[PDB]
């Protein structure tokens, strides 16, 4: 919801307790497109696979 | 790498196949002596599969290298 | 009269609609496309009750649209000559009675109601009555009328009724 | 050539199965109820509204079982599916009247048997 | 119990890329990640190679019968 520049990674830490993390996207071609560089806590992640 | 045979990983996980800690082969390949008689001999080779678990002795040994593409594959 | 019939329709679906919800989107496009329509062939399609099957979508060469021949069962109101159907008188006028049978508007001309009936232009509301005032039919009254003719229009059907037979008339 | 009085209908309609006004009322109310529960911003047509309330004014039966029963007890006789519906819609009282409204019934049954059928249907009215 | 050839004819491949490209141009959802190319033909081709094109080929036989073949079922030539 943070905007077209954002995706959120939510993951299950424990049964019934989930963490929500902000992913910043940069360099988008279109609203539907992936940003070339992902960011979290100011450090960069190169692709979704790196985040996982 | 051993049977020189391509197998889709699709079936390997679908078959329930179990994992090695790393890809190091003690393979048989019969090699010809300079007088032409072939007989196999092998001593450690290590191909990278879980690189950060690697011990301090081994890391800087790369001679040839299977790449996926993204540079994050090599972090650390 | 109301009937339950199997009907078929071919709907053209724009490529942007492809994707996961595709078939439900076809179901939904069908309802909005045939419900409420009217044809001289089948009458008024009151409502689609169920969809029998969605045919295989043939992709039309040249244009991106894929057309889906879908078979469905709908409630349809078909009038016929000779029908005897209950009708609600909606408006009474110096020239016959305007009445409605379900969605079908219907008219009973002054020349097709018994000789005794005459128009009363000042009643509240105006109405038809006999010389004895025994039967008086006005707005919102229920009339059994016999359909003697019909004309088909674009998405509409209009019928002409009669009160000349032995057991027609009020209520 | 089409005239319902003599039981002549188009080939395309002959295979159709008729519905009683109460039956249609149950169907159409089910449809409107389904319209409310699974709410989506979709609208009901004028033809549907003026058919639902019209059928409500002429729904001779209200109980779901009374519709199935009048239908079953009637189809036990040898009536055409057209007579099956108009005799449940019109609910003629005297047999002479039923034959006047639906001339197809002349000679189909004896007046006393026909009167029996009509009396049965009338007792089912709610 | 199909008897036609299990390989995709050059004509089938051509008409598939042609139609699927046109659907992509009309923004029907694309089945595979665009790395960022925008020519619908290049995307349709990428789909084909990944075998994700959602089309089945209705192959008519001379007698009047037909056999539906998913694009993911038969073998691509090129």
Curated annotation (Swiss-Prot), chain A:
Tissue localization of expression: Ubiquitously expressed.
Highest taxon of the lineage: Eukaryota
Subcellular localization, as worded in the UniProt entry: Nucleus
Known partners and oligomeric status: Interacts with RNA polymerase II and the DRB sensitivity-inducing factor complex (DSIF complex), which is composed of SUPT5H and SUPT4H1. Interacts with KDM6A. Interacts (via SH2 domain) with SETD1A. Interacts (via SH2 domain) with POLR2A phosphorylated at 'Ser-2'. Interacts with IWS1, AICDA and PAAF1. Interacts with histone H2B and H3. Interacts with WDR43.
Entry function: Histone H3-H4 chaperone that plays a key role in the regulation of transcription elongation and mRNA processing. Enhances the transcription elongation by RNA polymerase II (RNAPII) and is also required for the efficient activation of transcriptional elongation by the HIV-1 nuclear transcriptional activator, Tat. Besides chaperoning histones in transcription, acts to transport and splice mRNA by forming a complex with IWS1 and the C-terminal domain (CTD) of the RNAPII subunit RPB1 (POLR2A).
UniProt record similarity statement: Belongs to the SPT6 family.
Protein name: Transcription elongation factor SPT6
Native species: Homo sapiens (Human)
Gene from which the chain derives: SUPT6H
Curated annotation (Swiss-Prot), chain B:
Domain of life from the UniProt record: Eukaryota
Tissue: Found in adrenal and parathyroid glands, kidney and heart.
Modification after translation, per record: Phosphorylated. Dephosphorylated by PTPN11.
Compartments it resides in: Nucleus
Subunit structure: Component of the PAF1 complex, which consists of CDC73, PAF1, LEO1, CTR9, RTF1 and SKIC8. The PAF1 complex interacts with PHF5A. Within the PAF1 complex interacts directly with PHF5A. Interacts with POLR2A, CPSF1, CPSF4, CSTF2, KMT2A/MLL1 and CTNNB1. Interacts with a Set1-like complex that has histone methyltransferase activity and methylates histone H3. Found in a complex with BCL9L or BCL9, CDC73, CTNNB1 and PYGO1 indicative for the participation in a nuclear Wnt signaling complex. Interacts with PTPN11. Interacts with SETD5. (Microbial infection) The PAF1 complex interacts with Zika virus French Polynesia 10087PF/2013 non-structural protein 5/NS5. The interaction with viral NS5 proteins may reduce the antiviral immune response by inhibiting the recruitment of the PAF1 complex to interferon-stimulated genes, thus preventing their transcription.
Task of the protein: Tumor suppressor probably involved in transcriptional and post-transcriptional control pathways. May be involved in cell cycle progression through the regulation of cyclin D1/PRAD1 expression. Component of the PAF1 complex (PAF1C) which has multiple functions during transcription by RNA polymerase II and is implicated in regulation of development and maintenance of embryonic stem cell pluripotency.
Annotated disease: Hyperparathyroidism 1: An autosomal dominant disorder characterized by hypercalcemia, elevated parathyroid hormone (PTH) levels, and uniglandular or multiglandular parathyroid hyperplasia, adenomas, and carcinomas.
Family: Belongs to the CDC73 family.
Protein name: Parafibromin
